[PDB]
Amino acid sequence: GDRVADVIESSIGDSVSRALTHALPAPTGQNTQVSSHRLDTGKVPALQAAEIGASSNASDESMIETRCVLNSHSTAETTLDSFFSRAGLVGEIDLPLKGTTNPNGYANWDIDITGYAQMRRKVELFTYMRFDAEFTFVACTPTGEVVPQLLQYMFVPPGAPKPDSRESLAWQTATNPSVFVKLSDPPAQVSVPFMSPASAYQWFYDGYPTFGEHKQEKDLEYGACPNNMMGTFSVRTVGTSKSKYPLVVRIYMRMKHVRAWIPRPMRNQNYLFKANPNYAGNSIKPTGASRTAITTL
Amino acid sequence: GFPTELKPGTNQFLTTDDGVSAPILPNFHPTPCIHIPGEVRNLLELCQVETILEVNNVPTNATSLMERLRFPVSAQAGKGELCAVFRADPGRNGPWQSTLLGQLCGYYTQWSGSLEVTFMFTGSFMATGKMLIAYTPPGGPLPKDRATAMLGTHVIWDFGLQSSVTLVIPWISNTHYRAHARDGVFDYYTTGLVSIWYQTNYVVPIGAPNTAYIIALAAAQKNFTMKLCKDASDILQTGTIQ
Amino acid sequence: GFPTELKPGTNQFLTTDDGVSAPILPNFHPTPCIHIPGEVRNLLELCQVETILEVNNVPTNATSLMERLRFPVSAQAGKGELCAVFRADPGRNGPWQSTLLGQLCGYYTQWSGSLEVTFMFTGSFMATGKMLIAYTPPGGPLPKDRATAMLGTHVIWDFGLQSSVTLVIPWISNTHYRAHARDGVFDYYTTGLVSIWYQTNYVVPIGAPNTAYIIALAAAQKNFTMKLCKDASDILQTGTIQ
Amino acid sequence: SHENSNSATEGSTINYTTINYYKDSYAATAGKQSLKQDPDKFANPVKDIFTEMAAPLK
Amino acid sequence: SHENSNSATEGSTINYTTINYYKDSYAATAGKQSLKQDPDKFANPVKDIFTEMAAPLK
Amino acid sequence: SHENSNSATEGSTINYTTINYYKDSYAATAGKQSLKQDPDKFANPVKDIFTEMAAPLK
Amino acid sequence: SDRVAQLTIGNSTITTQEAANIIVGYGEWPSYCSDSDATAVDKPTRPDVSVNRFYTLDTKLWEKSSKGWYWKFPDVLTETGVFGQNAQFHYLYRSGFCIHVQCNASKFHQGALLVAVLPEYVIGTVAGGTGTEDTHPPYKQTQPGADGFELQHPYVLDAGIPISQLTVCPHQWINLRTNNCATIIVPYINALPFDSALNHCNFGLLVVPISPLDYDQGATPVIPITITLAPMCSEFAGLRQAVTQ
Ligand SMILES: Cc1cccc(-c2ccc(OCCCCCN3CCN(c4ccncc4)C3=O)cc2)c1
Ligand code: NA
Ligand code: NA
Ligand code: NA
Numbered sequence A: 001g002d003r004v005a006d007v008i009e010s011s012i013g014d015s016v017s018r019a020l021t022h023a024l025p026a027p028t029g030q031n032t033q034v035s036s037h038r039l040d041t042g043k044v045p046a047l048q049a050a051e052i053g054a055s056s057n058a059s060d061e062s063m064i065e066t067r068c069v070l071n072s073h074s075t076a077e078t079t080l081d082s083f084f085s086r087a088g089l090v091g092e093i094d095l096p097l098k099g100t101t102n103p104n105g106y107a108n109w110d111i112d113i114t115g116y117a118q119m120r121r122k123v124e125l126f127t128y129m130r131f132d133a134e135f136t137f138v139a140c141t142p143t144g145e146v147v148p149q150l151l152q153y154m155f156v157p158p159g160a161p162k163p164d165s166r167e168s169l170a171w172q173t174a175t176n177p178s179v180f181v182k183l184s185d186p187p188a189q190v191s192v193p194f195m196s197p198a199s200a201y202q203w204f205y206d207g208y209p210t211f212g213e214h215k216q217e218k219d220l221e222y223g224a225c226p227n228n229m230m231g232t233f234s235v236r237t238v239g240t241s242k243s244k245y246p247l248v249v250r251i252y253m254r255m256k257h258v259r260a261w262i263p264r265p266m267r268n269q270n271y272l273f274k275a276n277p278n279y280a281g282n283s284i285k286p287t288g289a290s291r292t293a294i295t296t297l
Numbered sequence B, C: 001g002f003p004t005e006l007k008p009g010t011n012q013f014l015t016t017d018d019g020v021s022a023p024i025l026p027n028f029h030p031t032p033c034i035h036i037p038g039e040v041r042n043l044l045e046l047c048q049v050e051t052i053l054e055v056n057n058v059p060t061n062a063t064s065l066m067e068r069l070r071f072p073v074s075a076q077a078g079k080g081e082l083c084a085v086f087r088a089d090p091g092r093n094g095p096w097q098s099t100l101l102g103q104l105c106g107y108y109t110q111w112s113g114s115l116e117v118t119f120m121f122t123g124s125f126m127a128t129g130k131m132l133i134a135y136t137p138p139g140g141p142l143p144k145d146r147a148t149a150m151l152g153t154h155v156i157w158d159f160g161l162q163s164s165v166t167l168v169i170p171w172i173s174n175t176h177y178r179a180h181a182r183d184g185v186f187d188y189y190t191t192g193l194v195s196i197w198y199q200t201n202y203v204v205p206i207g208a209p210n211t212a213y214i215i216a217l218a219a220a221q222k223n224f225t226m227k228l229c230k231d232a233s234d235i236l237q238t239g240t241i242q
Numbered sequence D, E, F: 001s002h003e004n005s006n007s008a009t010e011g012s013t014i015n016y017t018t019i020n021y022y023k024d025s026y027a028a029t030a031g032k033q034s035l036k037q038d039p040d041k042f043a044n045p046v047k048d049i050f051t052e053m054a055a056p057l058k
Numbered sequence G: 001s002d003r004v005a006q007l008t009i010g011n012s013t014i015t016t017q018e019a020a021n022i023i024v025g026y027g028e029w030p031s032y033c034s035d036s037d038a039t040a041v042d043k044p045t046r047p048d049v050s051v052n053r054f055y056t057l058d059t060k061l062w063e064k065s066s067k068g069w070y071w072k073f074p075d076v077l078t079e080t081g082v083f084g085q086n087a088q089f090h091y092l093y094r095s096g097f098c099i100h101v102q103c104n105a106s107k108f109h110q111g112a113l114l115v116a117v118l119p120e121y122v123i124g125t126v127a128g129g130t131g132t133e134d135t136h137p138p139y140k141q142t143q144p145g146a147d148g149f150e151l152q153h154p155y156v157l158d159a160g161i162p163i164s165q166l167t168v169c170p171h172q173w174i175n176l177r178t179n180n181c182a183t184i185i186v187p188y189i190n191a192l193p194f195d196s197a198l199n200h201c202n203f204g205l206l207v208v209p210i211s212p213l214d215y216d217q218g219a220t221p222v223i224p225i226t227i228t229l230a231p232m233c234s235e236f237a238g239l240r241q242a243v244t245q
């Protein structure tokens, strides 16, 4: 039991996070109300104090004489799902015949979508994201030709054995999920759930994955968060003998049922590496076009 | 089996098709979602947040990039001299590209709504002055003088305890929506021009800097909306990202 | 026929797709199901059953394999000497691989829950002693001495009629679930360390063995669960099985 | 339908209207989201709110 | 539906929720199983149960 | 159905009867239109209407 | 009446006579972790007053050529007072923060500092200038401790992102002709309920002059910028020996 006053009256333990703002319904743009001339003292909408950290509260009505306008313009297309639920390229995998890369009829791809600028820039607008996704696999030869070839795609989660060859025992796929499909068939397509151990994936992790000294040789791990590493995508031509055709697999991701937190400034320098925000120091360019003088167009 | 007949579209892969696809992990249940601050529900929420407008988008050497974030004002000769100008077109190349509004704008083909630019004076407390900021709707050429600019929508700013002032760029268009404006026939969708002039003069006493800077912050009004989702004009990658 | 349109996914064979397929034997009725003891409904039922933990996983020659099932304690010099140590990571290579919990764990990508290890003393009835068993949460390096280990979660075991004691390895993680930990960035999901020290000393009178053994049995607590089904790391076959 | 509740948005302040043929909800379509917005969370996160008519620094 | 009851789980302590288009129930999907568990059957198969607080050998 | 109202004819004096399987109404079929007609709008746009029996220039 | 203010927490009190209100990041106050959001089972320790108080950790000098600086939280405090100790002895940590950046001058000086908070502020490198070398920032740069660290290229925040858009984050400005301080309250921000105060920095505090400091010869040229901060609703769990990293 409790008895001393400071304990009885303390707020230690309040799990109810007080919120200063609440969301309101806004299916259309706000309307404009009629307004007239105002010649008042004390009243001053135009003047602000940006130092406070808040945006201007001044509206059209208070700055000029406005008419009434019934705005029925929809706000539907700017929802998270509307913006993100559009399949975009996130991975390309080659399976050549005579080659330097994967001349063995199989390949392993770490599931990381940061190798493509269009998609990457969009998701990096937010710090945390939680979503389900629809993946589509488009296969064909390097010329875009379709050939009678059977492939096997297998999802290898962290801890599961990664195939080391076209004949690896791991292809028995007794528990991992696999998709067998022909190039002649339409693109393969499946739904993937939100799989992180965290409540959300995060495109930015300012920290290290482990404890200890963080010496030069371990700096490759700064910013690496296992919670974002969902596993490997393995593919092979289904046979004990090398395929007759060179293949290319394009991977498209379409997010759905999206939630995002903490908006961030948008990338303005070319991307260089998947794992980090490194930029070319000798080519730091302005965010946009420039002109000769501030007083000329 | 049941009599069916395949129609055109069959086997096609539309990247924006909102369909149903087989689940790879049956009976899998995602990690519960705890509370995380700052959840955004609609991009329009972000468009109402003011970000810095690079009105002074002239310096280009790395060492001077930070200078683009602010432009100056200083004691003049009282002839209603011009201080600066810029197009109001938000989705057009220029000053607006530095703002989050301009960037998000790039992912949409059409937009509609009033805009606002708040100017913050960062001179010394002892500096005073009055500026005339004007918005010239389409059709009006760059005002040659303050008298001409004064004929459009404008605000007369007086420096004081309130460091900032807000210029509202009201929605004045012939069409309900504007596509991104650019030189050519698409200049049809131009929003107009914004010019800043000295109404009085930047006055300062002995002992205070003769030059101070103004920082411009821009965002959208609550009647702003965008439509027809598209890919942004920039692709931030040269070769493959490794 | 009825207007249909094929979507992507058509003709694909997803091994985990839970679909409907034509029955080969119409009107066939299976042999009735009599009562059979020991029906299991969920793998979690098995994870709560304790199996032997090979803390002493050092001997490798066939003739000594049985020695891995137990480790020793014996009269010391009373300096709070260290008896044994092992990582608590259940789905990691090491001692836990000998337990059914560890094996079943291998078929799942993520796990969550508290663990328990029960130690049974098999020395003579006349042998006595007190041991300190500690669990060091992530971040804490292998305790250099008993004083350091003592700062974490621990139990002080006293030998007596009750042959065993239970160390609970409470769920203390930053994430709701841990993936299988291993050297590298995945050490992020490590559970910690378990160290055993002499609190007093193994005391015995004249006529009784100066060395006795302890057998460790480990299982999961009732808050334990696993998710994201995957294939185990081992495939017990070399060539074709004939 | 009587399916599993494994959608990434299960328990969201904005309800969705979707389609599905499988027992796992995450297989469902994106559907329509609810149109709520909270601009102030980012544009006006001030403790003591200041009116429009008044001068921001009293 | 009005089908045959030839499923391998016909008459199980755990009921299932499945889909089927054929007259033979075993063609049906795996569906959802019921979440009952009896750990004690294996973890605590003792005749005279012993409390947690008390010492196991009285 | 409970879909979006993005059809080019949303709010027309002539109602339509259509089919659709998507959440966006413009994907729907053309269907049947209503058979209303207003010839006078073009054939007889006169202010002071003149009878048939009478002579048009009184 | 919005200019004057007093912040009292623990055994510490801050006053200011030229404020610009207070920002509460993402519109919500710090709070302790609920029983439904939690996952770790051990009973947490909540030291209260001995750790949730104001700590004045560092002072930098604003010069006509300063580029700007940043600090990482909770890194800045991991070695200070009772908070530091708790952060070292425990694996799990969580808390909010009240940040109070100070900088006064005279009615004859001028300049504007942008004070903002950026969650998961991941630092990047210049990649060898040409962008061919995959370099990485060293520990002393990602977790600079209390001395903070100076931005090499403030325009892109040393991370390839425009500072011009940093205002999308909780922030305030210190415009000398207007105010002499910034106050920002920040709730715990992470995708997990608790985390290591050593391995993970939840956010970064940026102080960057956007409008250069200026004054005439004869006016005090030494214009300090001091950083004071207070943890809020601190919680610790997963106890063992102390660890510095
Ligand atoms: C049956 C089957 C066959 C082949 C592939 C798959 C498959 C592939 C990927 C799947 O994972 C999709 C993961 C999407 C999010 C990936 N993330 C989450 C966070 N993240 C990230 C990247 C870089 N830095 C930080 C985070 C990512 O790249 C699921 C199933 C399934
Ligand atoms: Na037939
Ligand atoms: Na599918
Ligand atoms: Na027909």
Ligand code: NA
Residues within 6 Å of the ligand: C020, C021, C022
């Ligand atoms: Na079939």
